[PDB]
């Protein structure tokens, strides 16, 4: 099965949140993980703003992207927007993206409840074109 990696900046949760929608809606369509350029984190408000949509991220982890192989991630989605720093093995995939998607970390709960749907439609239209 093809594996989707979601990647973002050091202090971001949108890579972990993108994995949350993708493992819930893409559950029977693809394999999925998430990471960050100098690693990434889960966020308590991204648990509670998303469990009301039936999503889970609480059990997820991260390490710096250069510790991973890229090759076992047939599909790689960045969330930095038309500009990300990546080694060539992380971009040469059969499908690549770099989403123009913000982090709700440190913003209002209305921004969490907005960005969740922006992640959902990005995950959905990405997975629907590959599976």
From Swiss-Prot:
SMART domains: LMWPc. Gene3D superfamilies: 3.40.50.2300. Its EC number is 1.20.4.1, 3.1.3.48. The active site is at residues 8, 80. Signal peptide: none annotated. It catalyses: O-phospho-L-tyrosyl-[protein] + H2O = L-tyrosyl-[protein] + phosphate; [glutaredoxin]-dithiol + arsenate + glutathione + H(+) = glutathionyl-S-S-[glutaredoxin] + arsenite + H2O. GO terms for biological process: response to arsenic-containing substance. CDD domains: LMWP_ArsC (cd16345). The keyword GTP-binding does not apply. It holds the Pfam family LMWPc. InterPro entries: Arsenate_reductase_gluta, Ptyr_pPase, Ptyr_pPase_sf. Reduces arsenate [As(V)] to arsenite [As(III)] using glutathione and glutaredoxin as sources of reducing equivalents. GrxA is the most effective electron donor in vivo compared to other glutaredoxins. Constitutes the major arsenate reductase compared to ArsI1 and ArsI2. Also shows weak phosphatase activity toward p-nitrophenyl phosphate. Cys-8 probably provides the initial functional group for covalent attachment of the electron-accepting substrate, arsenate, to ArsC. This is Glutaredoxin arsenate reductase. It comes from Synechocystis sp. (strain ATCC 27184 / PCC 6803 / Kazusa).
